[PDB]
Design an enzyme around this catalytic site. Structure first.
Site, short mmCIF file in Angstrom:
data_model
loop_
_atom_site.label_atom_id
_atom_site.label_comp_id
_atom_site.label_asym_id
_atom_site.label_seq_id
_atom_site.Cartn_x
_atom_site.Cartn_y
_atom_site.Cartn_z
N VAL A 1 0.86 -1.15 0.00
CA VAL A 1 0.00 0.00 0.00
C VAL A 1 0.89 1.19 0.00
CG1 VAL A 1 -1.79 -1.11 1.31
CG2 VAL A 1 -0.18 0.34 2.45
N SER A 2 0.38 2.28 -0.54
CA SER A 2 1.14 3.50 -0.72
C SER A 2 1.61 4.23 0.50
CB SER A 2 0.40 4.44 -1.64
OG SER A 2 0.80 4.19 -2.95
N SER A 3 0.78 4.30 1.52
CA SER A 3 0.99 5.19 2.63
C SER A 3 0.80 4.53 3.98
CB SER A 3 0.06 6.39 2.48
OG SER A 3 -0.31 6.94 3.71
N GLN B 1 -2.86 3.84 5.16
CA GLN B 1 -3.60 2.70 4.67
C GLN B 1 -3.14 1.41 5.35
OE1 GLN B 1 -1.90 3.75 0.47
NE2 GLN B 1 -4.11 3.90 0.40
N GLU C 1 -5.47 5.31 -6.31
CA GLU C 1 -4.11 4.91 -6.50
C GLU C 1 -3.52 5.39 -7.82
OE1 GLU C 1 -3.09 2.80 -3.81
OE2 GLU C 1 -1.05 2.56 -4.42
#
Lengths: 136, 140
Positions: free
Chosen positions: B10-12, B15, B104
């Site tokens: 996941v990006s961040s 999350q 995303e």
């Protein structure tokens, strides 16, 4: 194993540019087995020369690949390549436009733009303005 | 022998709870898996530790299969390189949801736009001005 000279230009309008890139690679290297060239972007993952090469490296046909300057190979993912070559007995050699970046940028927006029209995202309007300016 | 990998990202850090979910989701989808690898960072990061390790493993003939929730999870660009890379090494990329998810995707464009802007400025390019604009335009 082999030593490969890989050269690429963005456009078929740059065919003149490509040979010179080849001569230059040829003058710098006087012991090379094979030459590979493409017309197109480093975005294009279908590029014929590039593919034949990628498998050749995977096939272990290649000891060394020489690129006239950076980003001849791909626009993104060099890290993956570095790894792929690093475990495949392979050294990647680099001797040293805006428009090529800029053109590469526009395509990405267009590519992302299809996805955005597909999602019916409110952002699609913003991407379209951006692109038209960029071509402006 | 042959290893089946569940790879998740996941990006961040925001999350993070969702990642745990992404993991549980993969596990529900595949009955049998050897190992679980997760990353935090964008899919544009070629230095995700989890990613490089997995990739590194594939280059070593330890992976029968890699499974991800979206192709997104592995990379934004050059997913094909991975595919050609996989075919070389007896590994398969199984993708349980064949799609791009919207939030995303947008994040991904913004970063690319940010990078291109620096390079453009860095070379005193005639065009940079507009790019900075697209970003502000895009953030909303």
């Amino acid at each position: 194993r082999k030593v490969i000279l890989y050269a690429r230009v963005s456009s078929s309008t740059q065919k003149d540019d490509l040979v010179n890139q080849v001569k230059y690679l040829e003058e710098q290297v006087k012991e090379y087995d094979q030459v590979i060239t493409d017309i197109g972007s480093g975005l294009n993952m279908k590029r014929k020369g590039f593919l034949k090469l990628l498998r050749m490296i995977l096939n272990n046909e290649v000891s060394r690949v020489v690129v006239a300057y950076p980003d001849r190979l791909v626009r993104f993912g060099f890290e993956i390549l570095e790894e792929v070559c690093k475990a495949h007995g392979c050294e990647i050699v680099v001797i040293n436009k805006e428009e090529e970046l800029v053109e590469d940028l526009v395509s990405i927006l267009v590519s992302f733009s299809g996805k955005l029209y597909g999602m019916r995202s409110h952002k699609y309007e913003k991407v379209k303005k951006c692109v038209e300016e960029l071509k402006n």
